[PDB]
Automatic annotation (TrEMBL), chain B:
Signal peptide: none annotated. It comes from the Viruses. The chain holds residues 34 to 43 of 124 of the full protein. This is Envelope glycoprotein. It is found in: Virion membrane. It comes from Human immunodeficiency virus type 1.
Length: 213, 10, 216
């Protein structure tokens, strides 16, 4: 039994947007309190509202949300959150939950008039002259993107251990940057980082080789 | 009628 | 309904016990509709305690809640590196006299484990970078505790601008951090200097990594 939210997107101020919470391994024909909770980047959890899927079928909202957002049960396995008149104050990750016990991984909403920009990807490798042996740490710098997020994998997700992907930072240009590095038994794998940026529909691969000489 | 929010097992 | 959570942050040792408080502007529903959550970065909240003091199924018994009415506390016994997270209280209220629910503002819990000195890596800009007009040099400090400070030097001169730092969450096994520090310059600036140095300092001991521009 699990939940998944979808519909997160970049939208302009004033827009409307509908998110969906999909149930798996159970159905809304039984009695639950299905609720939406949001979290602005770096901030705390905030309750939005709930719908009961049993008798009474009561919808209730936080005072701030009441009249601007709706929550409704749209099938035996889907609940929606409809949002209107969005502003920057509504930028957040949106979670749905069953009795505040089962939670989805969340879906990201960004409200901004900024135009998307795809990342540049550059390889990271020790200087030509760095001595042996045994291990080597390689990486990719992902630079100048907007808005968040990007996702980074290595060898299409088959390289998993020894990977550190740092949290992004919003640079002085206004654009985001992060790095991902991976430790690999030296002079072996040519490794490839796969960088995806959903807002621009782009995915870039960059193969990094240890520095020989 | 709804009294509150429900938290945890039902 | 306002649920005031204190403290906003606390640092505590592995093996200690640690306590968080939540105070409500009005009684919660039935005097006990109150729950506690743990949240790690990038993850959804996880229910730990509900009905003020009942343990959610599968949650370790070193987690304990108590209280009633408007005053509640939450205590972790035998704190572990795995506990390092942000914790939240949530109140459920009488829907007929106000809003049905309110979250407290959260408590960030930092856990102090055994000290570990960092190893350090410096990465010169890929050749493709200089063409763009700006150049970003990357320094990484691996697997360390407690916190470090980073100093950038260009031909001996300490840099005071163009620097950004990003730190990972604490390792669930040993409490360690990792850090990336980046120095950003124009290509013109980069091309007019030789030695690029990243110095990572923990207490009075530093690890220093450098390269020369024309050597890479
Ligand atoms: Ca709230
Ligand atoms: Ca309402
Ligand atoms: Ca405080």
């Amino acid at each position: 039994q699990s939940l998944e939210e979808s519909g997160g997107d970049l939208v302009q101020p004033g827009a409307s947007l509908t998110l969906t919470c999909k149930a798996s391994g159970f159905s809304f024909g039984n009695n639950y309190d299905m609720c939406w909770v949001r979290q602005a980047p770096g901030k705390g959890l905030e309750w939005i509202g709930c719908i009961e899927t049993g008798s009474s079928d009561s919808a209730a909202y936080a005072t701030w949300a009441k009249g601007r957002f709706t929550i409704s049960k749209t099938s035996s396995t889907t609940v929606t959150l409809q949002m209107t008149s969005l502003t920057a104050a509504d930028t957040a990750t949106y979670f749905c939950a069953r009795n505040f016990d089962l939670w989805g991984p969340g879906t990201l909403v960004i409200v901004s008039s900024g135009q998307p920009k795809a990342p540049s990807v550059f390889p990271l490798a020790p200087c030509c002259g760095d001595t042996p042996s045994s291990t080597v740490t390689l990486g990719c710098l992902v630079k100048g993107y907007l808005p968040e997020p990007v996702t980074v994998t290595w060898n299409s997700g088959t390289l998993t251990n020894g990977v550190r992907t740092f949290p992004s930072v919003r640079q002085s240009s206004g654009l985001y940057s992060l790095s991902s590095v991976v430790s690999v038994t030296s002079s072996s794998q040519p490794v490839t980082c796969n960088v995806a940026h959903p807002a621009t529909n782009t995915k870039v691969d960059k193969t990094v080789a240890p520095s020989t000489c | 009628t709804r009294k509150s929010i429900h938290i945890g097992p039902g | 309904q306002v649920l005031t959570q204190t403290p906003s942050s606390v640092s505590t040792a592995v093996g200690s016990a640690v306590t968080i408080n939540c105070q409500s502007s009005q009684n919660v529903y039935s005097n006990n509709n109150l729950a506690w959550f743990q949240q790690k970065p990038g993850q959804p909240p996880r229910l730990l305690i509900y009905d003020a003091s009942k343990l959610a199924s599968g949650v370790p018994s070193r987690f304990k809640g108590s209280g009633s009415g408007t005053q509640f506390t939450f205590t972790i016994s035998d704190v572990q590196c795995d506990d390092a997270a942000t914790f939240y209280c949530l109140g459920g209220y009488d829907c007929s006299s106000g809003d049905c629910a309110a979250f407290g503002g959260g408590t960030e819990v930092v856990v102090r484990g055994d000290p570990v000195a960092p190893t350090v890596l410096i990465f010169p800009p890929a050749a493709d970078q200089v063409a763009t007009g700006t150049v970003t040099i990357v320094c990484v400090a691996n697997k360390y505790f407690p916190d470090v400070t980073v100093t950038w030097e260009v031909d001996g001169t300490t840099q005071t601008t163009g620097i950004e730092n990003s730190k990972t969450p604490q390792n669930s096994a040993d409490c360690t951090y990792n850090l990336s520090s980046t120095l950003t310059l124009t290509s013109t600036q980069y091309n007019s200097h030789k030695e690029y140095t990243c110095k990572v300092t923990q207490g009075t001991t530093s690890v220093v990594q450098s390269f020369n521009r024309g050597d890479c």
